[PDB]
Design a protein around this ligand. Structure first.
Ligand code: NA
Length: 293
């Protein structure tokens, strides 16, 4: 959630650093790169080694190292911390504007409005097959790796018209980062239910999610997924109160024969049988049952 100055709110400013800190205080960059700090030192008439300058600024609490190499957060005067849970990802974009990730799973669901509680923990993202996660980020992010076409991000992102209808800001609804829309979210959690954490937080709001999904987008995002994903996605439509849509979606799958599938994050509670989708539900209805009690 927060990046905290180890020095507390009241930080000394050595004279050598006065213009550097004042410039960062005026400009308030989201992330400070090593190159940005190097240039600001030079501009200040400061001939300090950049690494040395940063080490001291770190020690005294003005810069806090971020997970991606060569990035820092500036903690502004008068503040003890920054409240921004996505600074690890912004630090990645600071080094690589083509990072190519999208907020996924619980983060996407949270900003789309399907969760009771703000999720915490590692930030769930989707990355295309071809993109590697920088090593510094593994402790901060969990990656879901469904081989969607990275070229068609219009498919992955929510429909702008949906954002407008939902009173979400066209650009800042997920705090300015790229994020999966409801269709890609639903397909993600149907394809790999274990990739999604707060199921109990989501399941009361399936009606809300399902009402926001276009079935054509669902179908194109399911194209190439295993049949089980289609079964589970169609059952989610049913569970969100749209059995006719669920059965129609399931009828558009590529493979005719439909093995029985489990809807579970880890098979071992109670279960419901949905023959329409050849699905044993160990998750959605069983959670709804615990929640009602
Ligand atoms: Na909705």
């Amino acid at each position: 959630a927060m990046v905290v100055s180890p020095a507390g709110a009241d930080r000394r400013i050595p004279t050598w650093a006065s213009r550097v800190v004042s410039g960062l205080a005026r400009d308030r960059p989201v992330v400070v790169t090593k190159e940005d700090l190097t240039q600001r030192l030079t501009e200040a008439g400061c001939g300090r080694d950049p690494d040395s300058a940063i080490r001291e600024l770190r020690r005294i609490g003005w810069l806090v190292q971020l997970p991606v190499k060569g990035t820092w957060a500036f903690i502004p005067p008068g503040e003890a911390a920054i409240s921004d849970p996505y600074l690890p990802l912004r630090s990645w974009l600071a080094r690589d504007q083509n990072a190519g990730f999208m907020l996924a799973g619980a983060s996407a669901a949270w900003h789309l409005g399907y969760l009771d509680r703000q999720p915490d923990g590692r930030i769930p993202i989707w990355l295309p097959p071809a993109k590697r996660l920088p090593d510094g980020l593994a402790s901060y992010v969990s990656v879901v790796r469904i081989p969607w076409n990275a070229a068609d991000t219009a498919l992955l992102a929510p429909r702008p018209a949906l954002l407008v209808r939902r009173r979400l800001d066209l650009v800042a609804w997920a705090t300015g980062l790229p994020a999966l829309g409801p269709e890609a979210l639903l397909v993600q959690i149907a394809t790999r239910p274990a990739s999604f954490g707060p199921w109990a937080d989501l399941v009361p709001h399936l009606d809300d999610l399902v009402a926001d999904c276009s079935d054509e987008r669902l179908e194109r995002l399911l194209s190439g997924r295993p049949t089980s994903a289609w079964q589970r996605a169609s059952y989610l439509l049913d569970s969100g109160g749209e059995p006719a849509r669920g059965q129609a979606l399931l009828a558009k799958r590529h493979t005719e024969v439909m093995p029985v599938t489990r809807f579970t994050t880890a098979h071992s509670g109670e279960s419901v049988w949905a023959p329409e989708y050849q699905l044993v539900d160990e998750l959605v209805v069983p959670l709804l049952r615990v929640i009602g009690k």
